[PDB]
Amino acid sequence: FTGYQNLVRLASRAYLEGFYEKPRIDREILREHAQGLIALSGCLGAEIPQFILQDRLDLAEARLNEDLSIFGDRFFIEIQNHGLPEQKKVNQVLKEFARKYGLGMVATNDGHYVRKEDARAHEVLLAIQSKTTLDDPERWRFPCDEFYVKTPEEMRAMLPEAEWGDEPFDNTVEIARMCDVDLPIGDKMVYRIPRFPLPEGRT
Amino acid sequence: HHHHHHKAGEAQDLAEGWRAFLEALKPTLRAFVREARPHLEGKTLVLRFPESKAFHHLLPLARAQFGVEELAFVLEKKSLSPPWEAEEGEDPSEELRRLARLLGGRLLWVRKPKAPEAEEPVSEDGIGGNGIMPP
Amino acid sequence: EAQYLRELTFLGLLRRYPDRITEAFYREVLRLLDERALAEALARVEEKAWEELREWTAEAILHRALYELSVIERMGFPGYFLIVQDYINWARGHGVSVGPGRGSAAGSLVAYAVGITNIDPLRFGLLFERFLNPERVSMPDIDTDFSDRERDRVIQYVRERYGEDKVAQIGTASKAALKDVARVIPHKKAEELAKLIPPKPLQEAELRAEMEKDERIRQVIEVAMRLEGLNRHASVHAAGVVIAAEPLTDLVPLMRDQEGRPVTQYDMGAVEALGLLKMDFLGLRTLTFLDEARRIVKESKGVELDYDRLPLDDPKTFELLSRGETKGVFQLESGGMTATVRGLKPRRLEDIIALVSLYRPGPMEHIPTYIRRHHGQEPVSYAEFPHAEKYLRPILDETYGIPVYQEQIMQIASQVAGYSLGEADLLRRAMGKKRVEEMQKHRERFVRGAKERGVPEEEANRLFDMLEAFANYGFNKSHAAAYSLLSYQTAYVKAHYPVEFMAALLSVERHDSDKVAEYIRDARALGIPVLPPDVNRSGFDFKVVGEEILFGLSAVKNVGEMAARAILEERERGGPFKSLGDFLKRLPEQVVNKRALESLVKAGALDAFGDRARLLASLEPLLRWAAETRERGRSGLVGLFAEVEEPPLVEASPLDEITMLRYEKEALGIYVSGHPVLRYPGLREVASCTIEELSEFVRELPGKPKVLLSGMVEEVVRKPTGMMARFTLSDETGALEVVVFGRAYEGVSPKLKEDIPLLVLAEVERVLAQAVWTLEEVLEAPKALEVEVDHALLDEKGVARLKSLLDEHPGSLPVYLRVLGPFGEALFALREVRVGEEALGLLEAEGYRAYLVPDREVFLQGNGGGPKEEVVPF
Amino acid sequence: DYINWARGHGVSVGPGRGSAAGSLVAYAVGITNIDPLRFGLLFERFLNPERVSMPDIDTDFSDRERDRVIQYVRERYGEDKVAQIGTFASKAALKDVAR
Amino acid sequence: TLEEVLEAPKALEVEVDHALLDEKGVARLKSLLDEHPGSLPVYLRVLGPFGEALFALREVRGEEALGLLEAEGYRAYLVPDREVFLQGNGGGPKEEVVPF
DNA sequence: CGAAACGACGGCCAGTGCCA
DNA sequence: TTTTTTGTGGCACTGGCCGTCGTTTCG
Ligand SMILES: [Mg+2]
Ligand SMILES: [Zn+2]
Ligand SMILES: [Zn+2]
CATH class of the missing domain: 1.10.10.1600 (Bacterial DNA polymerase III alpha subunit, thumb domain)
Structure with a gap:
């Protein structure tokens, strides 16, 4: 719940203060509101995996050091594999950071839709925000149709066993178990109700 | 921080100087450096506290940094740091006193008004006149 | 009405005597003719029955109880009883203390069983016949002690229970x-x-x-x-409360006093004469003190003090009274009384019962006889009454052969002369009244029953001479026994828990500034520290943290009651206060205003954060800062932007002890660490009459003598009618009302006012000053050598060692000798030898502690120095 | 407080809506402004005594002067403690x- | 001496292991003790992390507790009371030699 | 016609004077 | 426990200190 409260601020800060194109935050305020948060390295659009694509291993390490200074043992290496050749580049070197510092890896898929058959349903939803025809071209597209809620068995197809192992899969269930976020509701849930002030001063 | 509270104006501005462990005024600092040390440690122990600062990078953790070299001051005492004193005046005293501490009172003294007393009462005039009374 | 009284007695006897009167034993009694069912069944019948069934065994407790109920029912007072214990058992249930009982009331086993009285009347020598005379129809007068605070609540209960028009307090x-x-x-x-x-x-x-x-x-x-x-x-009586059957307006006319309490126009004797029920609700302070004793002991160490289940033979409790530590021990605080207990060395409760009863002008002469008999250095003989011995011994052994209590004489009369214990009561009345020749009825009546019992009529007449003598100063045991129990409870709390007992004393009399000052110095000279208040650790009132007495927040002068609570309540929901900034940003000026903040710093409640002179300068700056932080937080924001964390404390030079203690006096009411006088201890030594030792020292001296005394001035007056300024000299041992009448001569001419020390020559009979000297007048005046030798020095060596070492250093300094003897600090100025101010250091080389103290003999005149020149160095 | 504030600072408050008009206390203090005992208005429908449920008091304001009354609440109770609810x-x- | 100890006054006792939850005392224990009054004190041998402490709470006093008290890591002995072994009254030293 | 600011005030807490 | 020459209690009224209401003037 302390983490949930920090997420409530970080989200509120991003809109109220750091809003330009999207609602953005800082590593400075993340440092302030990192209490009770678990961090993952992120998708290809993230800080470390983008620095790796620029052939800049020196900046991604120091950026990993900056996040490792904030979250400590609450930081993790996010390893997600779709069809992308850029993920080969990234995941290979991410593995080295994971093995050097001893951070532990967590597997994910970055799903935007439920099943694989939604691929076109999602793709047309992109064309509605982009306001273009099915064959524009140059329309807001996603690189594939692999962005869905995959089966545990189906994850191994993307992440081979004699290469990754079981640590990405097992950590996924361990972190899910340890995320004990109970919002105050049910037999819980107290009333945050104000007093008012006072007369003068009486009951 | 208990010392940092005792702070009697300019009292602790010299206190931070006197039992030191600094580095010739200390680069980028500050006085005290013993304010940061317990922030690094995080009292009492406490496992999830002294790791924090070492992982980013009481006394042994403080010695583990650190701006040592210099070596100035020691105690806690050490120094640096018509009738009157007199004669003249050093110190050590050359007329009255002391069986010191009293020594120390003549070094903060100079100069050059007599009385007062200040702080205030009230024996520096008496010990002076009494010292003149035995020629 | 009589049956419900019996039920409550049978129910009561079970809880008051667990090991003796059990469910099993009650069933048995039913068989010779749920626990509550048995008491119910025993009530029903019936006098004829009970009668047939006609140390303290289980059968004896019944017979006593059965006999008293028989008397109470027959005389027609069962209703009177049921009214009494109702408001007493209500008081207990609604958090109001009730005393063990006063007067004769404690003698009744029915009263004890049900809950009017709270002392075992059959364990001690208490009698029901003393309380209610069975052979005479007279209404009993039950008086009950209460907590002085909660006394009105029990009267308020009665007013609602029995009706507003039927209940009122008696006028005086x-x-x-x-x-x-x-x-x-x-x-x-x-x-x-x-x-x-x-x-x-x-x-x-x-x-x-x-x-x-x-x-x-x-x-x-x-x-x-x-x-x-x-x-x-007309006015209201302290204890007097009346409960009439029919509305008061029908018989007795009424009033209403300034506080709105309904008051009878008739007095006690006029109201009783009409035949109305009268009750005395007394307000005792010991019960109030014992309430705070239980709460502090439970708060400190998690112990539930059950006063009614304490052991009466605790060794530490009696050996504390044996050491004469009766500072706050109930019924035992008098000067001579304290000395009398240390001489007596009491070991059982009966020693305190006898001591309290004997200690008064009259029977006091018997106390020394009691002490030697008690300590085991004088045989208890009854050789004067050999035939009567067997009857006298079991009565008088408890008090070592001394007729102390009224109940003894009744027992001695009843057993020896064969009287009924009811008419032995009447005999006591006759001896007190001293009726010319009517008690000659009791003489011959005593003689007849005496010789029928065995006494040869030579002793019978002389035995009666003994009774009439001790009857004048015969005290009521029931009352003395009950009140002695409260003394013992008081002593018990002190012996085992001395810190919280001292903190209780401070708590009870927290408003009186003189007592507080007395209680602190008693605690400081007993190993128990008494610290100033503290926002982090102090409670509302006095508190015991670990083994240290700690002042409350309410004790601070300018700090409000709402403020005292608000400060405390803020600390509980949040953490302990980390800094000055944290304090005044969490607690706005709204609640804790600047006036209260200043007084909190002066009191020392913010000493954890730093120096007081520095904190007092940092107030307004940080008040502006704290005012600005809210204005930012009251507009979205979060933290780093909303707060530039508290600045360094606004520098200031530290306070000197004179002005520091002067602020402490303004903050709380009295000084913190005793003092100031003893900061310059050269004058304290001179003290020819310490404030405490003035009475002790001056009385054994010539008719109205003179003496010099120092301390601190704490009062401002001048004149005219002249120069008549009343100042108060205060020491670490006390203070005095010094005049300031002789000064109009003229004139001593002080003009000193508060916060400056003085030396004062004065005549005593009250004290009347004549000449005065400030600190610099003392320090300039020619000084003298003073050695402080211990008692340990034999005379036939012969003490030539001290004389030899004083010979070698002639000069012109009078030599003074402080001999700490077995009792009293002596003062001895020497003889011919005058030191030359070199022998001070050369004497300290040996095992003697010398000083360069001001010469006492010099203090006089107004020249040579002079008084002008003694103002120059200051 | 804010309803009485509204009346004094030129903001017309409605006589009430929902079950709020049922309470005499509401009427007396001035939340609602119609005589509940004159008409057949009952308290027990507003607050059921035999059930601890928080009563929802809705108040009608002038559509022009409605933002002022909200602004009063923002200033009074704290800017960080007052916000309007969202609707998706x-x-x-x-x-x-x-x- | 031993011969005194074995014949001396026998105060009640309950030995308690360091393992102790907050929701076990002091209501359940004091209730069992209050129901049986007597003339002997009770003690608490707390076998702590380092050293054997003794918290002799208060007059509480009954010989049925043993059965319910061993239903746990705690045991009840009738030892010669540690907090005594001082003073020179009440007993005393003579009446400790008498029953031997 | 509404807001802002000055001016007069109100309420509470604390001390201090005498009631059983 | 009651009487005396005394102290202390407990309550009531005044006064000094921080946020409130009303009128008035200017935008
Ligand atoms: Mg009476
Ligand atoms: Zn992404
Ligand atoms: Zn994503």
Whole structure:
């Protein structure tokens, strides 16, 4: 719940203060509101995996050091594999950071839709925000149709066993178990109700 | 921080100087450096506290940094740091006193008004006149 | 009405005597003719029955209880009882203390069982016949002690229970007649006229020759004797409360006092004479003290003090009274009384019962006899009454052969003369009344029953001489036993828990500034520290943290009651206060204003955060800062932007002890660490009469002597009628009302006011000053050598060692000797030897502690120095 | 407080809505402004004594002067403690998919 | 001496292991003790992390507790009371030699 | 016609004077 | 426990200190 409260601020800060194109935050305020948060390295659009694509291993390490200074043992290496050749580049070197510092890896898929058959349903939803025809071209597209809620068995197809192992899969269930976020509701849930002030001063 | 509270104006501005462990005024600092040390440690122990600062990078953790070299001051005492004193005046005293501490009172003294007393009462005039009374 | 009284007795006996009166034992009694069912069944019947069944065994407790109920029912007072314990058992249930009982009331086993009385009457020598005389129909007068605070609540209960119109409180000089008329204040000669009777009426009053001196006095005395009988006006009685059956308006006329309490127009004797039920609700302070004793002990160490289940033979409790530590021990605080207990060395509760009873002008002569018999250095003989011995011994062994209590004489009369214990009560009445020749009925009656029992009529008459002698000063055991229990409870809390006992004393009398000052110095000289208040650790009132007494937040002067609570409540929901900034940003000026903040710093409650002179300067700056932080937080924001964390504390030079302690006096009411006088200890040594030791030292001296005394001035007056300024000199041992009358000579001419020390020559009879000297007048005046030698030094060596070492260093300094003897600090100025101010250091080389103290003999005159020149160094 | 504030600072408050008008206390203090005992208005429908449920008091204001009354609450209780609630089709979905 | 100890006054006792939850005392224990009054004190041998402490709470006093008290890591002995072994009254030293 | 600011005030807490 | 020459209690009234209401003037 302390983490949930920090997420409530970080989200509120991003809109109220750091809003330009999207609602953005800082590593400075993340440092302030990192209490009770678990961090993952992120998708290809993230800080470390983008620095790796620029052939800049020196900046991604120091950026990993900056996040490792904030979250400590609450930081993790996010390893997600779709069809992308850029993920080969990234995941290979991410593995080295994971093995050097001893951070532990967590597997994910970055799903935007439920099943694989939604691929076109999602793709047309992109064309509605982009306001273009099915064959524009140059329309807001996603690189594939692999962005869905995959089966545990189906994850191994993307992440081979004699290469990754079981640590990405097992950590996924361990972190899910340890995320004990109970919002105050049910037999819980107290009333945050104000007093008012006072007369003068009486009951 | 208990010392940092005792702070009697300019009292602790010299206190931070006197039992030191600094580095010739200390680069980028500050006085005290013993304010940061317990922030690094995080009292009492406490496992999830002294790791924090070492992982980013009481006394042994403080010695583990650190701006040592210099070596100035020691105690806690050490120094640096018509009738009157007199004669003249050093110190050590050359007329009255002391069986010191009293020594120390003549070094903060100079100069050059007599009385007062200040702080205030009230024996520096008496010990002076009494010292003149035995020629 | 009589049956429900029986139920409550049978129910009561079970809980008061667990090991003896059990469910099993009650069933048995039913068989010879749920626990509550048995008491119910025993009530039903019946006198004829109970009668047939006709140390303290299980059968004896019943017979006693059965006999008292028989008497109470027959005389027609079961209803009177049921009313009494109802409001007492209500008081217990609603958090109101009830005493063990006063008067004869404690003698009844029924009263004890049910819950009126809370002392075992059959364990001690208490009698029901003393309480209610079975052979005479007279209403018993039950008086009950309560907590002085919660006394009105129990009267308020009665007013609601029995009706507002049927319940109300009862309504309530020669010297004044001469003065009070004249007053409508100085006299000055009018007091000398009324000092002739310090009062009995002028009807009698042999210095009446003053009348015929002046014609003014002729009338005034004759007029004053005519206005004596008036009883002043009307007012409320402390304990008096009446409960009539029918509305009071029907018989007794009423009033309402200034506090709105309903008051009877008749007095006690007039209300009783009409035959109305009267009750006395007394307000005791010991019960109030014992309430705070239980809460602090439970708060400190998690112990539930059950006063009614304490062991009566605790060794630490009695050996504490044996050491004369009766500082706050109930019924035992008097000077001579304290000395009497240390001599006696009490070991059982009966020693305190006898001591308290004997200690008063009359039976006090028997106390020394009691102590030697008690300590085991004088045989207890009854050789004067050999035949009567067997009856006297079991009665008098408890008190070592001394007829102390009234119950003993009743027992001695009943057993030896064969009287009924009811009519042995009547015999006590006759001996007190001293009826000319009526007690000669009791003499011959005693002799007849005496010799039938065995006494040969030579002893019988002399035995009666003994009784009538001790009957004059015979005290009631029931009352003494009950009140002695509260003394023992008080002593018990002190012995085992001395810190919280001392903190209780401070808590009870927290408003009186003189007592607090006394209680602190008693605690400081007993190993128990007494710290100032603290926002982090102090509670509302006095508190015991670990083994240290700690001042409350309410004790601070300018800090509000709401403020005291608000500060405390903020700390609980949040953490402990980390800094000054944290304090005043969490607690706005709204609640804790600047006036209260300043007084909190002066009191020392914020000492954890830093220096007081620095904190007092940092107030307004940080108040602006704290005001600005809210304005930012009251506009979205979060933290780093909303707060530039508290600046460094606004520098200031530290306070000197004079002004620091002066602020402490303003913050709380009295100084923190005793002092200041002893900061310059050269003068403390001189003290020819310490404030405490003044009475002890001055009385054994010539008629109205003179003596010099120092301390600290704490009062401002000047003149005129002249120069008549009343100042108060205060020491670490106390203070005195010093005049300031002789000064109009003129003149001592102080002009010193508060916060400066002085030395004062004065005459004593009250004290009357004559000459005065400030600190610099003392320090300049020619000094003298003073050695402080211990008792340990033999005379036939012969003490030539001290004389040899004083010979070698001649000069002109009087030598003083402080001999700490077995009892009293002696003062000894030497003889011929005058030191030359080199022998101080060379003497300290040996095992002696010398000083360069001011010469006492010099303090006089107004030249040579002089007083002008002694103001120059200051 | 804010209803009485509204009246004094030129903001017309409505006589009430929902079950709020049922309470005499509400009427007396001035939340609602219609005599509940004159008409057949009952308290027990507003607050059921035999059930601890928080009563929801809705108040009608002038549509011009409504933002002022909210502003009063923002200033009074704290800017960080006062905010308005957020509010998030079959035909629309068909057409957009048709495009 | 031993011969005194074995014949001396026998105060009640309950030995308690360091393992102790907050929701076990002091209501359940004091209730069992209050129901049986007597003339002997009770003690608490707390076998702590380092050293054997003794918290002799208060007059509580009954010989049925043993059965319910061993239903746990705690045991009840009738030892010669540690907090005594001082003073020179009440007993005393003579009446400790008498029953031997 | 509404807001802002000055001016007069109100309420509470604390001390201090005398009631059983 | 009651009487005396005394102290202390407990309550009531005044006064000094921080946020409130009303009128008035200017935008
Ligand atoms: Mg009575
Ligand atoms: Zn992404
Ligand atoms: Zn994503």
